Structure formats: C-alpha cells, structure tokens
Write a protein that binds this ligand. Structure first.
Ligand SMILES: [Mg+2]
Ligand SMILES: [Mg+2]
Ligand SMILES: [Mg+2]
Ligand SMILES: [Mg+2]
Ligand code: NA
Ligand code: NA
Ligand code: NA
Ligand code: NA
Ligand code: NA
Lengths: 1007, 204
C-alpha cells in the first residue's frame, strides 16, 4: 500500500483526538492531578533496529525480536544514537521535491517492546496505546497483528489495542519511516531527525466513558462575574441513570458544582446530542488568569451513576480569562497586551528533539527571569507538558499547527491545492481538539511559511467557528491576508520599508496605517539573534510603547540548535549544519538563539531583559517617576534601590518601597545630594528588586534598572608638572624616547610604535597599528541559505587586504615632552581607502597621549571600526575598566549595559559564540586597566587571547587556540552589529561609520 | 573665559602655541576649550580645537570661534553649501559648490534681528586677503552677535567697523516645528559632550 506516499492517507484506525486524559477512578486524585493507575508509561528500554528502506525489514521481526537489534532508550531520535545522521537544512527540502513521493532509500526504524498487561485491564473496558510523537509516519503491529498507521510527527496518535492484547506478555512492533508525504508539510528550519521521540503510554478507559470535554469561561463587563461552561461527550451505552458532575475548585475550596443526566439541547430538525451534556457554573469574583498572575482553578469532570458510583474522572486546570480583539487591539481580560515574546523550538544538545521536564522548567524560568511573558510554539504543537507549565507558571502561548512547506515553489503550491486540504486539515483540527482547554494558549496559528492558499482560508474559518475564544493568526502570503486576525510579519523593520514584490515587509509603524487597515500588529518573528546580534532591539521597544496597535512580538529565537559531538580525545564540542556529513546543509543558520544549547545566556539576553522591563522611569530634578506597565498586579514584591556614584566611586544609596498600581505611577524623592569630594560625572542607577522568592524567581532577583547622568564637575585643575623630561634618540631606523624606566620605540620605516619597555621587559608582541576591519559577525556575512552583504562589500573594496603606506614620520622636542607625528595611507589597487594622521606626545610624567584623525573615502563602504590594535606581551588575570558593562555591548546594543567600574577575569571578556567572530566589545569606556597598563579616553575595546585574524579564519569555537600574549583592540568608533535579519544588510544608518572624518584620543600610561 | 594654560614651543619648522580655557558661571564650569596653534614656515596657522561641554549645562547654541576683522571686502567666496543661508536642520536645498556673492547677501535681513546667514559644510572660505580651510559652518557680516541680540528691528542696525566672522565647528539646529516651545530635534542639539574641529588660516 505505500501509505507513506499518499497524502489522502494520513492514518489508519486512529482514534479521535481529545484533551489530555488519565481515566482516574478516584475523584480526589483527579482534583490534585496525582498520577493515575490507569495511565501507564511505556517509556524506558526498547529494542531497535535500523534499515535503509522499509523493503529491507524482515517479516520475522513482526513476530519475533531480531537478535541484531540493540536495546535503546525511548523516547529518542535515532540520529542521536548514531544510527544515521541528522541533517540541517533551512529552506530546501532534504529530499527531492516530487510530491507526494519520497526517496526509495528511506531510513526505517524498527522499534519493539515486550511488556506485561494485567488481566484486570482486559476483563473490562478499553485499552489504548498513545504515541505522543513519532517522526515522520509509522505502522503499528501488536502480537504480530497489524493495528494501524499514523502521520503528523507532532501530535499524539492513539490506537485501540483491546482486541489485540492478552494477559501477561505482549509484543508491540512499530515501523517508523523517516520520510513520508507528511514530510512535505514538515519543512521547518531545524535539524531533520526521526524516531519515537515523545512519550508512549497505555491508557485504560471504561466502556462507558468521557470521550471529550470542552471548558469555556465567559464574563460580564467588568469581569466581576463569570460562567464556566463545560460540554461533555461520552461514548459507550446511554442509560438514564448516568450522570455527569462538573466541580470547580480553587485550591482546596470547592467553588461550584453541577450535575446532569446526558441529553443536550435541541440542535436542528433531528433533535440534539443525546450523548452530550453542558453543565454551567456561576462564579462570583473569579480570580483571573494572566501571565502576571497565573491564578488557576481545577475543573473535575465525573462520569457516574445516579446511585453515586464513580465510573471515571477526567479534569483540567482552568484559567478564567477572555481574549478578544476590539477596536484594533488584542485584549486580555479587557486590557491591551504588550507581548514580550520569544519563538522556541524543542531542542536539546544531547537528546535532539526529545523534551524533558527539567529542560522545559529551566527554559520557562529563564524566560520569566528575563522579562518574557509569551512564547510561540515555532512551528508545531509541543509536548503536552509544555502547556501545563505555561498555564501554571504564567506565559501567553501561540499554539501552531505542524504545517510548513517553505521549500515549495511558489510557497503556496500545496496549501492552495485542494488535494492537500485533508492532510492540512488534520494538522489544524487535531491540535485544536487536544489543546483548547489550556488557558495559556491565547492564539492559534495555522502554521508557518507555507505561502497563502485557499486551504488556509478554509482552516482559519474552521477554527473561528469551533473556538471563538481565541484569535487566529498566520503570516504566510504577506502577513496581512484574509487568514489572519493579527498583522504578524516576520522581520519587518521599525522605520524602514522592504518593498518586496507581492509580499512586501512594510515598516511596522507604516503598516498599521495603510489604507483600510485596522488590525493589531505583533511580529511573529523579529530581532534575529544569530550570533553577535540584537543590534537595534531598543528601537522596536520604543515603537511598541509609543504605538497602541504595535503590541509587541516574538524574538527569533530562544535557543541555539547546536548539537554535541566528541573529538578524537572524547571531548565535547558544539556542532552545526554539515558537521554530521549532512549535505546539502545550511551551516550555522541553525543557531539563532538568545541562549546557547546548554542554556547559558548569550550577551543579547540582557538587552532583551532590559528592554522588556515592566517599570518605566523618568527623572526630574531629584524626583524619579516610576510607571508600572503591569495590567493586573500591583508592585507587591518590589522595592526600589538607588545608587549615586562619581566616576564609579560610590557616594550614596537608598531604598524605597514601590507601591504602584497597574498602569499607575509613583513619585520618589531622592535625598539631598551634598557635594562630591572631587571632579567628574555623577551617575544615578536604580534597580527594581524583588525581596521575596516566587515560583519563578529567587529572593533578591533584579527585574528592572535604569541610569542617568547627574551633575558633572569638569576638571579644571592642572597637572603638577613633571619632575623630569623625556629624551629622544634619533637614528635612521628609529625614534627612541626614554623616561626613567620606560622606553618607547617608533620604527621609522613603518611609522608605528614597535616596542615599549618597562624596566627590562618588552611590552609588545606586535606593533600598535590602525585597524579598520573586524572578524565578520553572522549579520556581516548575511547568509540564511548577497553582494550587498557588509562582508562582501568590505572584501570587494580591499579593506581586509589593505597595506599601510608611510607618508610621514617625524620627531620634535617640546619643553616638556617628545612629540612623534605620523601619517599613513591605506590603499588598495591604487585606491586610497583611509588616511590616518597621528601625534604621540610623551611627557615628563611618563604618559603617552595619542591623537588620531582618520579620513575615510566617501566612496568606500563605511568601515567596521576605526581604532588601533596590538598584541601585548603580557597575560594578566583581570580586566578592570570604567565604562559600560559588565557584559559585551555594542553601539546598537548597549542599553542594558551600565556605566560603572567593572572588574572581570580575562576570560569573561571573550564571548564564545559557536561560530567565532568579533566579540566581547565594551563601549563608552573612559578607563581600562590590564596588567601594568592603563588607557584613558572615550573608546570601545575588546581584549582577549584571540586575534581578529584568527577569529575570522576559524569556523568553530572549539578550534580556537590562545595566542601568545593578549590582543587588545581599542576603538575610537565601531559600527553597530545589526540583526533586524541575518540575511541582508541590517545595520541602521545611524550606526554606520559614514562621517568621512573621525577623531579620537587615547592616553596610555603605566599603573 | 578663565585661562588655564598658555604655552609656546619652538619646533623645527614652526611655533606651537598651546592653550586651555574654562568658561564658568557662578563657579560652575560650563565649557573647556583646549587649543593648539601651529604656525609654519609657510605662513599658515593651523588651529586645532577640542572642547568639553558639561553634561548638565543646556546644550550650547554653537561651538566655534569669532573675531572682528579690520578688513571690509566686497565679495565672499566659499567652497561649501549655498548659495543661500542654511543651517543644520535646514540645508537640504543648499548645494555644495563654489559660491561668490557680495558681502551684504551674506546677511539675512530678518525684520526681528537674530543670528543669521550661516552657510554650512564649508571647506574653504575667502575674504579679502584671508583664506580659512577646514570643515565648518560660518557667517560673516558687519554686525556682531551682540548687536543682533540687542536690536529689536532690522532698520536700527548699524554697520560696525570692520567685519565680524563667526566660524563654527558645530552649530545647533534652528527648529520651527512651532515657535513657542523647544522645537529642535535631538539629533540637531549639540549634546556630544566633546567636540573636535580644526581650521587652517592663511593669507593668499
Ligand atoms: Mg500518507
Ligand atoms: Mg492506587
Ligand atoms: Mg503469554
Ligand atoms: Mg522556514
Ligand atoms: Na503598543
Ligand atoms: Na535558523
Ligand atoms: Na512593593
Ligand atoms: Na569566523
Ligand atoms: Na534681536
């Protein structure tokens, strides 16, 4: 039958989809969500054998264990066990495009398990098997008899095994196909793996049973009263003595309860549903659910007889909340949301696509701790537990159908094709039937990157019809089609339009007001966090806050999809596309997250946390104005800490309790700030601290911060002039300067300071020279699978090959110092790119002041940076500076950083991006200390054991090796990093170094 | 202006004068200007200016130099934006080229007198025997800023002796979104804290 090559066959003998069941036979257990003896897990050790095609599978396997098989854990992705390679492809399908056919060589995973079933389960009732996730299609046999077939790798497939089992031992055999026609709908940008990768379980239900239940909550105008409506359906024999009781609890208190016999209201000329009933419960002053306060009730659904015998119980967590779009705004409990979201794929560096509770909880806590309030299930229904954690911890969720046909040409080839309507329809309907009772799901999504086809319109209407409680969104076909209630573009810019034909990406501000447009706009993906990125994040936040209808978005994306591999010596390392022999592949494009695969944060995570803060602040005089962005809670676990410092020197500080109602304001008046002991800039830093632990944070957590400059007292006092004067020695080869124990040597042919000595010690490994390039970032490279790419432009202009030419090198003696003047030109193929003019003035105090004036040809691409570099001979333990920090920060990604005195071990000054590049910069620095050296001015810098050259020649962080010494890059100016997208120029004009002429000054001295 | 430092050094082919000044008010230091004047064997005087402006003082209207020249010449010739008056936030219409107008055209007769006639993006300016070269904004006229500020009506202005020359490294925008509240966009306010500029003055 080749069911795996026919989109008209998506399953055989599969049971209806429905919300999570456990068939409790004790109501109390159901109330508290205790494990159910009737829901058994079949997870653990299974037998597995790999074959190259289904035709290669021996018939014997059906009845008996293959002695060649291995014992492996389930759930798992077979790739993770080494059976075949995982493939990383972004857009292009991993198999030839020839729907609905798949390759003849099709990796087949043959799983089996010998397990016990007690007579008790078979004497009465129904025993079904549930496979929560099988990638991509499979056939199932039990005790050698075929049972059924299934597709859609991201929803549960259930089969009735009642007629196939026997008491005692039984054997299941599952043949899993890697590719199937379902793969045409699973083209998400992620590793392509396969196997039985979600839980497998057995569930016993009685013959007369609860087969479905839907829960709804409706409110009066001010949410002071609600009606919970529970529709219950049964299967099995209708009898008048049957009853359904629905009880609602808030903690240990029962709020309401109602009971009724089956038999629904009249529906049409033929009557009503005699196998259903709707119970309605009034609830006064319900505690409402939100991501701010995830108040939950428990609904327990009992199927029982009138005499009072329980047949079975089902249940769920209920969050009383209304989601509606009104007047152009998305409202939650009548208030307009501000989505601080992130896209999150199911990825584990060791386990592949298998999810576990610990990782899920770790992700949600880091999300919450970083001011995220929402998550998009990019791009398929998640493991069931995700929803329960979101309901209980409090996150808004976008639940998305497992439909992505990005590699088709044009993109909607399948989605506009009625023959694909059935297959797509099951992806949407079964998701809704499974997840509709979760309060955390606030919006349904039709899938991702599958163009816009009629199938979409049909399905959009189906959902609107069956579940009016949530908006439906879909971005394909231009982000604003008839299949979406929300304008939900991906990578639309704040101010700049990207007018692509047919599917333009307008500036978000402009998009809201195009003629006739009235919907809210929430980006389904924005701020592509690949590598050293998130430049311009603040620009989005400023617009979201200014424009009512700009309600936020979902950053792309949470975690890097890197996988662990082992080197020849068994050490682990982070791998990406192509590292498994996979080809074609999309290399590093699989790593776009705010956190590394092990959950360590990248530096961008702090920028996101700060911009996503829930408290806004303004300063006037001595008055700090705090405004709350919360919609529902008061600041009942928050205090404000304030600190004032003079050039990093702590002056004073205080604490004030915060008592701000949602959307309210609080005025706090700072105490008299009595004169600073010396000159400099006073800085005010405020931090919102949570004194009490919560379910998602520890006592002391800081949730928000802000700084301002206060009074500045410029230094007008002079320097107690030199006890001495430096001496200059001139030679054809060099200009040497000596002062006490110091010596500086300027090479006359090169025109650079080539060596420095303190005592007998040489301070330099490589001379101090101008630098106008950087080890390109992922965004500079711009590839997702462009000669407009910054890297391309730079290379083409000769920026990385340019050679300095000496125009002038002279020495002069002043009354108290020695002054060296140089001028160099950087040229390429006759073209003068840059001209650097400098003066170095060494004085009686031993300080070397360097003044640099650079000219940039207006017609060369603006340079990545304008500074100097050198390789210091020494390797020191700490890096101390007065500037922004403590983490890495760049011009267009420095808002989260704070101006203060920071001191870190050298290593923290390096950000180990998997794909190495320029990294570790710190901006707005006025003082930098390392070893015996001190540099002063107003610059940006990075310091590490890796040169820019090495970083640009290395593909993987594990292959980096520390060089002799310490490479110092000190810049007067540095270009922003961009990141609106990672596959086109994305650095805003204001962060490009296009001024033509640049000036900067550094003071280098000892410590 | 309070003098902080003033020195002179002799070099191989020039004389270098270094200065430092603090502008204060009631004791508060508003601005610091540090300069170097390098006069070479060629007769050219290169002036390098580095100014610091207190972060807490309101952003200044301009950062430049001024003086009253003894000369009064008929023409003003410059290589920069023109030909008409133009300011930072009002210079899109101006074109970069070589312009030459009579001195009075370098004055704009606003009925209510004020700063006027600036020309920006100027790389060279010629007046009588002098030439200034750099990347500056300038206005030149027979009226001092002081007179302009003190006179309510254009008809009452009187030509002073000589020519007043205002040469700016930087100049604030003029605004106008409205004329009854602050209206100069942030990007045209001089808030950088530290500013650098350089000019070359020569005869010929
Ligand atoms: Mg099929
Ligand atoms: Mg028990
Ligand atoms: Mg047996
Ligand atoms: Mg895609
Ligand atoms: Na908004
Ligand atoms: Na990607
Ligand atoms: Na509080
Ligand atoms: Na690299
Ligand atoms: Na006036």
């Amino acid at each position: 039958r080749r069911d795996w090559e026919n989109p008209g066959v998506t399953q055989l003998n599969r049971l209806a989809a429905h919300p999570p069941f456990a068939s409790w036979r004790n109501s109390e257990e159901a109330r508290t969500d205790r494990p159910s003896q009737q829901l058994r897990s079949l997870n653990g050790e299974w037998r597995f054998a790999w074959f190259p095609a289904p035709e290669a599978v021996p018939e014997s396997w059906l009845e008996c264990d293959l002695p060649e098989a291995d014992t492996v854990v389930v759930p798992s992705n077979w790739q993770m066990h080494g059976y075949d390679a995982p493939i990383y492809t972004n857009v292009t399908y991993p198999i030839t495009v020839n729907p609905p056919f798949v390759p003849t060589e099709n990796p087949t995973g043959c799983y089996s398990l010998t397990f016990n079933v007690d007579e008790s389960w078979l004497q009465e009732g129904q025993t079904r098997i549930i496979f929560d996730g099988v990638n991509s299609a499979f056939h199932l046999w039990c005790n050698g008899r075929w049972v059924g077939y299934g597709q859609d790798s991201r929803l549960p497939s259930e089969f009735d095994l009642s007629a196939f089992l026997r008491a005692g031992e039984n054997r299941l055999a599952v043949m899993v196909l890697r590719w199937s026609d379902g793969s045409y709908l699973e083209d998400q940008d992620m590793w392509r793996m396969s196997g039985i990768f979600r839980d497998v379980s057995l569930l016993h239900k009685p013959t007369t049973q609860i087969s479905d239940f839907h829960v709804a909550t409706r409110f009066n105008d001010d949410f002071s009263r609600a009606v919970l409506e529970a529709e219950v359906q049964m299967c099995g024999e209708l009898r008048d003595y049957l009853r359904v009781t629905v009880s609602l609890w808030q903690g240990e208190t029962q709020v309401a309860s109602g009971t009724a016999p089956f038999g629904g209201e009249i529906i049409d000329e033929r009557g009503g549903y005699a196998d259903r009933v709707t119970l309605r419960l009034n609830v006064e002053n319900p505690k409402l659910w939100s991501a701010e306060i995830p108040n939950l009730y428990r609904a327990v659904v009992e199927l029982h007889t009138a005499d009072g015998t329980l047949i079975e119980a089902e249940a769920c967590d209920v969050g009383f909340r209304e989601v509606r779009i009104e007047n152009g705004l998305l409202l939650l409990n009548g208030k307009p949301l501000l989505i601080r979201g992130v896209n999150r794929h199911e990825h584990h560096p060791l386990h592949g696509q298998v999810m576990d509770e610990q990782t899920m909880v770790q992700d949600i806590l880091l999300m919450k701790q970083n001011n995220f309030n929402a998550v998009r299930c990019s791009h398929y229904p998640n493991h069931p537990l995700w929803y329960t954690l979101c309901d209980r911890y409090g996150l808004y969720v976008v639940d998305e159908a497992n439909i992505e046909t990005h590699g088709m040409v044009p993109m909607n080839r399948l989605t506009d094709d009625p023959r694909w309507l059935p297959a797509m329809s099951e992806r949407v309907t079964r998701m809704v039937q499974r997840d509709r009772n979760h309060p955390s799901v606030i919006i349904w999504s039709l899938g991702n990157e599958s163009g816009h086809g009629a199938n979409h319109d049909a399905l959009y209407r189906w959902i609107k019809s069956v579940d009016p409680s949530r908006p439906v969104q879909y971005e394909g076909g231009g982000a604003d089609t008839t299949a979406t209630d929300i304008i939900c573009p991906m990578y639309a810019r704040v101010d700049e339009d990207q007018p692509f034909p047919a599917v333009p990406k307008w500036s978000i501000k402009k998009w809201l007001s195009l003629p006739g447009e009235t919907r809210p706009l929430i980006l389904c993906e924005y701020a592509h966090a690949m590598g050293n990125s998130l430049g311009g994040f603040a620009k989005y936040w400023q617009a979201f806050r200014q424009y009512p209808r700009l309600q936020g978005g979902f950053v792309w994306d949470w975690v890097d999809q890197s996988l662990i591999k082992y080197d020849e010596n068994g050490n682990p390392w982070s791998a990406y596309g192509g590292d498994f022999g996979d080809t074609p592949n999309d290399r590093q494009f699989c790593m776009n997250g705010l956190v590394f695969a092990d959950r360590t944060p990248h530096p961008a995570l702090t920028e996101a946390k700060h911009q996503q803060q829930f408290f806004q602040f303004r300063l006037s005089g001595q008055t700090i104005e705090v405004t709350s962005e919360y919609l529902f809670r008061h600041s009942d676990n928050e205090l404000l800490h304030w600190m004032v410092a003079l050039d990093g020197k702590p002056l004073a500080s205080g604490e004030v309790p915060l008592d701000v109602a949602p959307q309210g304001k609080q005025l706090i008046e700072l105490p008299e700030l009595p004169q600073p002991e010396s000159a400099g800039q006073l800085w005010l830093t405020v931090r919102v601290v949570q004194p009490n632990a919560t379910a998602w944070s520890e006592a002391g957590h800081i949730s928000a911060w802000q700084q301002w400059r206060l009074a500045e007292n410029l230094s007008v006092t002079l320097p107690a002039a030199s006890h001495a004067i430096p001496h200059l020695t001139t030679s054809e080869m060099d200009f040497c300067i000596e002062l006490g124990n110091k010596r500086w040597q300027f090479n006359r042919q090169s025109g650079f300071l080539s060596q420095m000595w303190i005592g007998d010690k040489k301070q330099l490994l490589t001379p101090l020279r101008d630098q106008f390039t950087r080890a390109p970032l992922d965004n500079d490279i711009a590839v997702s699978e462009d000669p407009n790419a910054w890297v391309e432009r730079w290379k083409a202009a000769g920026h990385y090959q340019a050679e300095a030419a000496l125009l002038q090198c002279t020495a002069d003696t002043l009354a108290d110092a020695v002054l060296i003047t140089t001028a160099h030109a950087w040229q390429h193929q006759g073209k003068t790119l840059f001209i650097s003019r400098k003066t170095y003035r060494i004085d009686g105090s031993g300080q070397m002041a360097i003044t640099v004036d650079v000219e940039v040809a207006s017609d060369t691409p603006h340079p990545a940076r304008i500074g100097l570099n050198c390789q210091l001979a020494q390797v020191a333990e700490r890096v101390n500076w007065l500037g922004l920090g403590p983490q890495e920060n760049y011009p267009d990604r420095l808002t989260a950083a704070c101006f203060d005195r920071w001191d870190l071990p050298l290593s923290d000054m390096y950000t180990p991006y998997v794909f190495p590049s320029e990294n570790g910069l710190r901006c707005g620095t006025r003082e930098l200390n390392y070893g015996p050296h001190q540099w002063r001015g107003d610059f940006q810098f990075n310091i590490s054991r890796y040169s820019q050259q090495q970083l640009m020649e290395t593909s993987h962080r594990h292959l980096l090796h520390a060089e002799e010494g310490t490479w110092l890059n000190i810049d007067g100016f540095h270009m922003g990093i961009g990141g609106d997208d990672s596959w086109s120029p994305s650095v805003s004009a204001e962060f490009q170094l296009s001024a033509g002429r640049y000036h900067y000054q550094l003071v280098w001295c000892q410590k």
